[PDB]
C-alpha cells in the first residue's frame with residue numbers, strides 16, 4: 001500500500017506515535033516519506049547483506065528475521081515480511097522499540113539527513129487529525 005500523507009499521519013497518530021519519546025508527528029511522517037516514499041512494500045538491500053523493510057525501512061541486521069542475514073538479531077521478534085503489510089501496526093511497534101533504544105530517530109539516516117532541524121510540522125499541515 002502507498003499511503004497518502006494525511007492518511008499516514010492519521011494512522012500513525014492512532015497508533016500512538018505523536019510525541020512518542022518527544023518526537024512530534026511530523027518527524028515520523030517526514031521519515032516515512034524519505035525512507036520509503038510512503039510505500040509499505042519498500043525493500044532495500046544493504047552492502048553488509050542486511051535488508052531494510054517497509055514504510056520505515058527497518059533493518060534485518062537488528063530488528064526482524066528474514067532468514068538471510070546471518071548473525072543478525074530479531075529484536076522486534078517478527079518476520080521482516082510482517083513489516084510490508086498494508087497494516088502498519090507491526091512497523092509502528094517496532095519503530096517504538098528502535099526510537100527508545102538510545103539514539104532516537106537518528107537511527108533513520110533519511111530523518112537525520114533530511115528531516116532533523118527542518119520545519120517538520122509542514123508534513124502534517126492541512127491534515128484533519
Ligand SMILES: [Cl-]
Pocket residue numbers: 024025026027120121122124
Ligand atoms: Cl509535527
Ligand SMILES: [Cl-]
Pocket residue numbers: none
Ligand atoms: Cl527524494
Ligand SMILES: [Cl-]
Pocket residue numbers: 065066067068069070071072
Ligand atoms: Cl537470518
Ligand SMILES: [Cl-]
Pocket residue numbers: 021022103104105
Ligand atoms: Cl531523543
Ligand code: NA
Pocket residue numbers: 060061062063064065066069072073074
Ligand atoms: Na535479523
